[PDB]
Amino acid sequence: KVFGRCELAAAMKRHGLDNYRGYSLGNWVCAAKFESNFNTQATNRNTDGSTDYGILQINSRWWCNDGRTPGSRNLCNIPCSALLSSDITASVNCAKKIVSDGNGMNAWVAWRNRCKGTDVQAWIRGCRL
Ligand code: NA
């Protein structure tokens, strides 16, 4: 599924991501934009041989099991394919654990480099929320 911007904002809000660990909804929407372009089926190979899965590009090194990331953990206890679902429940549940891990949203390098400190509320402008 390719979400629309306000569609994704509404789904993230419904699953309680807005102001989760103090990150306003615009931060989550901005991260999804640059990680996945709002595409639930986005997969990208990392140099270390790990893969990033889904709207929030969650890494098989630590968070999900893909059967092919040696020495990896599955701290969200889910198959990585569950993060490609048109239903974002699993991706949100996992992102909550990631963002609780001590470095907040800096764990998303595209958030640090492209969203952090910017006008993130622009991302939920004109949305019926
Ligand atoms: Na893994």
As a whole number of angstroms, the distance between CA 7 and CA 114 comes to 21
Protein residues near ligand 1, an ion, with CB under 5 A: 60, 65, 69, 72, 74
CA separation (Å) from 67 to 56, 64, 70, 94, 125?
20, 9, 8, 18, 40
Tokens 């991302």 belong to: 123
Binding site for substrate, by residue number, is 101
As a whole number of angstroms, the distance between CA 41 and CA 86 comes to 8
- How many domains does the chain contain in total? 1
Beta-ladder partners of 2: 39
Instruction: Examine the residue annotation and report whether 52 is marked as an active-site residue of this protein.
Output: yes
Tell me which of 7, 18, 35, 87 is the catalytic residue.
Answer: 35
As a whole number of angstroms, the distance between CA 53 and CA 44 comes to 7
50 Cα: distance to centroid of ligand 1 (angstroms): 8
Domain that holds residue 86: 1-129
CATH code of 15's domain = 1.10.530.10
Beta-ladder partners of 23: 20
Instruction: Examine the residue annotation and report whether 35 is marked as an active-site residue of this protein.
Output: yes
Q: What is the dihedral of CA 23, 24, 30, 32, to 10 degrees?
A: 70
For this experimental structure, what is the resolution in angstroms? Answer: 1.6
Please state how this structure was obtained.
Answer: X-ray
